[PDB]
Amino acid sequence: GWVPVTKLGRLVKAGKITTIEEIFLHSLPVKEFQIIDTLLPGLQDEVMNIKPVQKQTRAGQRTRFKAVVVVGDSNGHVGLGIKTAKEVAGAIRAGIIIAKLSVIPIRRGYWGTNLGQPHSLATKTTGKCGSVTVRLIPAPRGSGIVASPAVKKLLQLAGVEDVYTQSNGKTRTLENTLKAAFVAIGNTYGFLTPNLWAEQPLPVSPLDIYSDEASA
Amino acid sequence: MENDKGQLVELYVPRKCSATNRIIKADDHASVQINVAKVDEEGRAIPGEYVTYALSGYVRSRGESDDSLNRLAQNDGLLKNVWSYSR
Amino acid sequence: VLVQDLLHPTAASEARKHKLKTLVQGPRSYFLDVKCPGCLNITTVFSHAQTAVTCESCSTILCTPTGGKAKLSEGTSFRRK
Amino acid sequence: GKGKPRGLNSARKLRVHRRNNRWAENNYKKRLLGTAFKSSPFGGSSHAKGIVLEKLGIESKQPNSAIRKCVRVQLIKNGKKVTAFVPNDGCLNFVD
Amino acid sequence: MRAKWRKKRTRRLKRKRRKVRARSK
Amino acid sequence: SLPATFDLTPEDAQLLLAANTHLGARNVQVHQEPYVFNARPDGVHVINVGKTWEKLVLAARIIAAIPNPEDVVAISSRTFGQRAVLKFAAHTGATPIAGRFTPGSFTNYITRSFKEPRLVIVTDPRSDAQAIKEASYVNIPVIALTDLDSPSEFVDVAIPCNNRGKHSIGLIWYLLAREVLRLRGALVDRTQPWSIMPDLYFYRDP
Amino acid sequence: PKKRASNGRNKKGRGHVKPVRCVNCSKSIPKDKAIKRMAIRNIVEAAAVRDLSEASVYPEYALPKTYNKLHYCVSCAIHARIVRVRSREDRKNRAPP
Amino acid sequence: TRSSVLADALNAINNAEKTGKRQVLIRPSSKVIIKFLQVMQKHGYIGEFEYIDDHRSGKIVVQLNGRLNKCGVISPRFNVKIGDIEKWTANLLPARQFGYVILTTSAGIMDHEEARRKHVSGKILGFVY
Amino acid sequence: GRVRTKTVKRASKALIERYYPKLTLDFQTNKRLCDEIATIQSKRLRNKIAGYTTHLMKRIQKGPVRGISFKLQEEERERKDQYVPEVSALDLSRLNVDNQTSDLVKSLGLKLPLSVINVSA
RNA sequence: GACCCUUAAC
RNA sequence: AGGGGAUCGAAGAUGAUCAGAUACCGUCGUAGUCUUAACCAUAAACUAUGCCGACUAGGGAUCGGGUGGUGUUUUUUUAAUGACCCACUCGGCACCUUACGAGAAAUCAAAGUCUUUGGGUUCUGGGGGGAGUAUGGUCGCAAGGCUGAAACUUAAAGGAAUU
């Protein structure tokens, strides 16, 4: 079946934790991809590009393919996985595993007057990887995802429907742009807003109380 | 955020570091949750009773984590003459 | 050291730091009452005098200029303030 | 302070600095020098008519090997002698 | 070629141009 | 407010002074350590033993709050702490390590030395940098025995004591086990001493 | 790129340091950049010492030594193996071997 | 030399906020600084601040809670019409539902929403969020 | 050359770690039990293991060898680390303190018999 | 000690 | 341009290379580092980092100068001091990390506080080449300095890593 090897992987297997927000709440480290695909059973993966990389050797170039995979359900969770393998099919599968392992929550907000469900981002957010930084600006209804197709797909896989995007650097370096967007998309929960100035109490962690579900 | 028409939203209201009150990120794996047990008039740790402190990975990497805990728990009264405000 | 009482520093910490780096800058120098032996002729002398002070009675030089605090002459006694 | 002046009364310096530095742009320099008007063989027009003077066998630049079919053309409005490609296959026999 | 000597070669060329222009000016 | 029975007793004082816990680090001391009390001439710093003891009880309370006894791990790379951790780990659950730490013990789930602890105790932050560094990947708190010049980074609780004395390092390990057991109830009598003595925890070369 | 933070020499706060001539090739090298080695050698080469001492007219003769500060250019220091090419990390070790 | 004491004060607050410190010393405590802090304090971005009366120019120690993300100065103090407030708020504030553009008007130092309901304008001092 | 590989080094180490009281220093009497204790597919290989077993046996005979730990060794190792002294550190082990240490005890409000010995040159 | 060069020809 | 010219030594003849060697190596050797109305004004003139100001981590050392320790040692031996030792402090030359932060990276005590973009201010750049090449101007005795194009031609040139 699965037979997880981790306390957190055991807890999700045992069913004592049912939300990925509870994993995100206590910043738990996740090391198995099987716990992502059970706690988020609606993740859709995609491939933004496949490119070969070559290491020059004494006799010829060793060609390996770098697969970029973006994983996410269409509401609030998104992941990004890069893996270079000797075969494209092997790289896709492993890059899926890394993409699910790296899934993060998304903070969707409103452009104004909190009328319906969150359609946009709560704040302006920026992330940088290499020379690339991606700026994400909240947009009103109907604006859509104003972004390049590669950034756009990851962003619609996150659950946002109205956004503005602004970039600089080598946007043609695809892996950097997606990682820069991933950081900006991830930094949406790092930003502290007045409605998040609330009380401390921080209840017990799932791993401490449910430690009865250890390897024994 | 949460509007009036129900609409259960703002998933995962995150924790905040006790020392600095900054948001603990979902993958900030340098942050810790300190559990300091309580004792009831006999020097025996009563189960399930402890004061909890969230400690951001930022202060942990800065070496201020030890100083922060001495100040926080002294303010809570479980250390007496360790931390000085006037340093 | 994230949390610090910057309004009430310790006297040891305040005394340690530079005179312009304390919460309110203050002179570390002082005035002292110097008398020669015999005749009282009490003369008030700045600690960092930088001029050779002699008492008002006669030529009885009481201190020698120094790069910092003025060194007092061999035969004399001084009281702070 | 980022180099450039920031004062509320430094608009002239920012204006003059921009003016001087637009000359490093190729298009602004070419436009305001009027190079197309003064140097280009069409005089700044999209098209020009002329008379064919001779058939040409311009060789291809490396790494391609081919004989491009071109014609020397003296433009009517200028008298300047230019070289025009005859594009399609066998169209040299139309532009003899 | 070495920029030092290309600078020197141009300077010798400039010197010759000054001399050849002087015999007409 | 402690119940006024955890205060440093005179017997625990003499235990510290004979072990030379108070004798602080050399002419170098870290600015994140307010544990210094009244340096003597020749540059030797004197450590406030009360703060050492007070932090010692605080560290024990954090240890006792962990529900599974084995889920705490004691770590010691130095020779002087190698015996102490095992003796400390003998009297509690505390699945220990001694000697070399294996990189990938906290990450690298398929390593044969994998540990999923809720609390890590290290004898020397400088000599156990890898253990502390790897502890900053998996969200686990760290308790450390830190001298006045120790690298306090990633250390949540620091017990001030000299790291250049095998008597004091072993004594602090001894007191940590005794305090933790006293809270857990294994040592019922708070006032009465422990039959086990600190010289069990000390090191010996041959 | 920049190879060394000290630029291959010892000159921060000066601008100019007077040259010294290499003892192998007489190359002009700034003194702060030379590879100076101090040679303190027994004057009898330690294999004739007993022959010299047994032929000496004085008992327990002090056997004086010769003192010479030898300056090398970088080329001659490397060629005569006074210094050797080092890895990028351990170029930062000022402590003598 | 020293040009904007508000800039150095806001820089000290920003650098203290970034390092997690709960307090910061400010020199030399102009009245514009105090008004900028009171607007900050009114919205809860700092906490308590104490003026120190050295007979020269004043010192401020500001207590810092963890709420302030960035406070800044806009230099020069640009003239802001009523219609230009939207451009300034949209250019530097992280969102529309929180954050304040602080401007000095003839009715006093205030944040932009207070200048909107009082229907005043003037020169922009800075921002807080 | 003369060096042997892991397949005989770990095999010999594994046997000693498990079968210590059954084998001994002599090669000939160790060959007879190595081929019946462990399934070895080659005459040459079994000869190599028996040689490396008796080699470590000679080394074990004089002091412990790093890496190998059998049941007898670890049992006696425990007996070594359970030892505790009889006398206490408090008494004459053949309270020295300084001025700053002495007033530290008085600041803490404790009374202990200690001789205040300042820095005497 | 001395040691220059290297296909237009898929 | 007068004085000095020991030394070394652009220029200027032997030997090896031979196809040379009017190069590198030997021996010489003129001009060439002192005073001027003196000129020239350029260097990888480099920290390839403009200046002023504020703030942001650690740790020792050193140069100055002060402060505190009846600290240690010193004429006529323990009757002015000096030189050392600890602790501070101000200013300076610097010094240990792919370090929070910054960076394309190398790396960075600033090259941080920069898409969460504004402390003040000067100068410079806008693909490579043609080309720092004048039809010009100006300074200079000259050598040259400063200022400084266009035609034309290119798909790269370039930086830092990796193998």
UniProtKB/Swiss-Prot annotation, chain A:
User: Entry's PROSITE patterns?
Assistant: RIBOSOMAL_S5 (PS00585), S5_DSRBD (PS50881)
Origin organism of this chain? Saccharomyces cerevisiae (strain ATCC 204508 / S288c) (Baker's yeast)
Q: List GO molecular-function terms, semicolon-separated.
A: small ribosomal subunit rRNA binding; structural constituent of ribosome
Q: What does this protein do?
A: Component of the ribosome, a large ribonucleoprotein complex responsible for the synthesis of proteins in the cell. The small ribosomal subunit (SSU) binds messenger RNAs (mRNAs) and translates the encoded message by selecting cognate aminoacyl-transfer RNA (tRNA) molecules. The large subunit (LSU) contains the ribosomal catalytic site termed the peptidyl transferase center (PTC), which catalyzes the formation of peptide bonds, thereby polymerizing the amino acids delivered by tRNAs into a polypeptide chain.
The reply to whether Metal-binding figures as a keyword in the UniProt entry is: no
Single biological process term from Gene Ontology: positive regulation of translational fidelity
Q: Has UniProt tagged this entry with the keyword Zinc?
A: no
Keywords, alphabetical: Acetylation, Cytoplasm, Isopeptide bond, Methylation, Nucleus, Ribonucleoprotein, Ribosomal protein, Ribosome biogenesis, rRNA processing, Ubl conjugation
Which PANTHER family does its entry note? 40S RIBOSOMAL PROTEIN S2, RIBOSOMAL S SUBUNIT
Gene transcribed to yield this protein: RPS2
What highest taxon heads this organism's lineage? Eukaryota
Family, similarity comment: Belongs to the universal ribosomal protein uS5 family.
Compartmental location: Cytoplasm; Nucleus, Nucleolus
One GO cellular-component annotation of the UniProt record comes to: nucleoplasm
Q: Gene3D superfamilies, per this entry?
A: 3.30.160.20, 3.30.230.10
Q: How is it modified after translation?
A: N-terminally acetylated by acetyltransferase NatA.
Q: Report the protein name in the record.
A: Small ribosomal subunit protein uS5
Q: Which NCBIfam families match?
A: uS5_euk_arch (TIGR01020)
Ranges for domain S5 DRBM: 43-106
| A Pfam family reported for this protein in Swiss-Prot or TrEMBL | Ribosomal_S5_C
UniProtKB/Swiss-Prot annotation, chain D:
Please indicate which superkingdom the organism of origin belongs to: Eukaryota
Residue numbers of 3,4-dihydroxyproline PTMs: 63
Question: Keyword Ribosomal protein, does the record have it?
Answer: yes
- One term under GO cellular component: cytosol
One GO biological process from the UniProt record?
regulation of translational fidelity
Protein location: Cytoplasm
Query: Among its keywords, does the record have Acetylation?
Result: no
Provide the record's note on post-translational modification: Hydroxylation at Pro-63 affects translation termination efficiency. The stereochemistry of the 3,4-dihydroxyproline has not yet been determined.
* Cross-link Glycyl lysine isopeptide (Lys-Gly) (interchain with G-Cter in ubiquitin): where in chain: 55
Signal peptide: which range, if any? Answer: none
What else does the entry mention about this protein?
Present with 10600 molecules/cell in log phase SD medium. There are 2 genes for uS12 in yeast.
Report quaternary structure and partners. Answer: Component of the small ribosomal subunit (SSU). Mature yeast ribosomes consist of a small (40S) and a large (60S) subunit. The 40S small subunit contains 1 molecule of ribosomal RNA (18S rRNA) and 33 different proteins (encoded by 57 genes). The large 60S subunit contains 3 rRNA molecules (25S, 5.8S and 5S rRNA) and 46 different proteins (encoded by 81 genes).
| Entry similarity comment | Belongs to the universal ribosomal protein uS12 family.
Q: What is this protein called?
A: Small ribosomal subunit protein uS12A
Full-sequence range covered: 2 to 97 of 145
From Swiss-Prot, chain F:
Q: Any phenotype upon disruption?
A: Reduction in growth rate, a decrease in free 40S subunits, an increase in the amount of free 60S subunits and a decrease in polysome size.
Which GO MF term does the entry hold, naming one? Answer: structural constituent of ribosome
Q: Which residues carry this modification: N-acetylserine?
A: 1
Q: How is it modified after translation?
A: N-terminally acetylated by acetyltransferase NatA.
Q: Which UniProt keywords apply?
A: Acetylation, Cytoplasm, Ribonucleoprotein, Ribosomal protein, Ribosome biogenesis, rRNA processing
CC per GO annotation:
90S preribosome; cytoplasmic stress granule; cytosol; cytosolic small ribosomal subunit
Q: Where in the cell is it found?
A: Cytoplasm
One biological process term from GO is:
endonucleolytic cleavage in ITS1 to separate SSU-rRNA from 5.8S rRNA and LSU-rRNA from tricistronic rRNA transcript (SSU-rRNA, 5.8S rRNA, LSU-rRNA)
Protein family (similarity comment):
Belongs to the universal ribosomal protein uS2 family.
* Assembly and binders: Component of the small ribosomal subunit (SSU). Mature yeast ribosomes consist of a small (40S) and a large (60S) subunit. The 40S small subunit contains 1 molecule of ribosomal RNA (18S rRNA) and 33 different proteins (encoded by 57 genes). The large 60S subunit contains 3 rRNA molecules (25S, 5.8S and 5S rRNA) and 46 different proteins (encoded by 81 genes).
**Extra information:** Present with 93700 molecules/cell in log phase SD medium. There are 2 genes for uS2 in yeast.
Q: What is this protein called?
A: Small ribosomal subunit protein uS2A
Species the sequence originates in = Saccharomyces cerevisiae (strain ATCC 204508 / S288c)
The coding gene here is RPS0A
Q: Which residues of the full protein are shown?
A: 2 to 207 of 252
Swiss-Prot record, chain H:
Assembly description: Component of the small ribosomal subunit (SSU). Mature yeast ribosomes consist of a small (40S) and a large (60S) subunit. The 40S small subunit contains 1 molecule of ribosomal RNA (18S rRNA) and 33 different proteins (encoded by 57 genes). The large 60S subunit contains 3 rRNA molecules (25S, 5.8S and 5S rRNA) and 46 different proteins (encoded by 81 genes).
What gene does the UniProt entry assign to this protein? RPS22A
Function, as annotated, reads: Component of the ribosome, a large ribonucleoprotein complex responsible for the synthesis of proteins in the cell. The small ribosomal subunit (SSU) binds messenger RNAs (mRNAs) and translates the encoded message by selecting cognate aminoacyl-transfer RNA (tRNA) molecules. The large subunit (LSU) contains the ribosomal catalytic site termed the peptidyl transferase center (PTC), which catalyzes the formation of peptide bonds, thereby polymerizing the amino acids delivered by tRNAs into a polypeptide chain.
Q: Which UniProt keywords apply?
A: Cytoplasm, Ribonucleoprotein, Ribosomal protein
Compartment(s): Cytoplasm
- GO-annotated biological processes: cytoplasmic translation
What is the protein name given in its UniProt record?
Small ribosomal subunit protein uS8A
Q: What Gene Ontology cellular-component terms does the record carry?
A: cytosol; cytosolic small ribosomal subunit
Organism from which the protein derives: Saccharomyces cerevisiae (strain ATCC 204508 / S288c) (Baker's yeast)
Regarding protein family, the annotation reads: Belongs to the universal ribosomal protein uS8 family.
GO molecular function terms here? structural constituent of ribosome
* Keyword RNA-binding found: no
Q: Which PANTHER family match?
A: 40S RIBOSOMAL PROTEIN S15A
* Stored Gene3D superfamilies: 3.30.1370.30, 3.30.1490.10
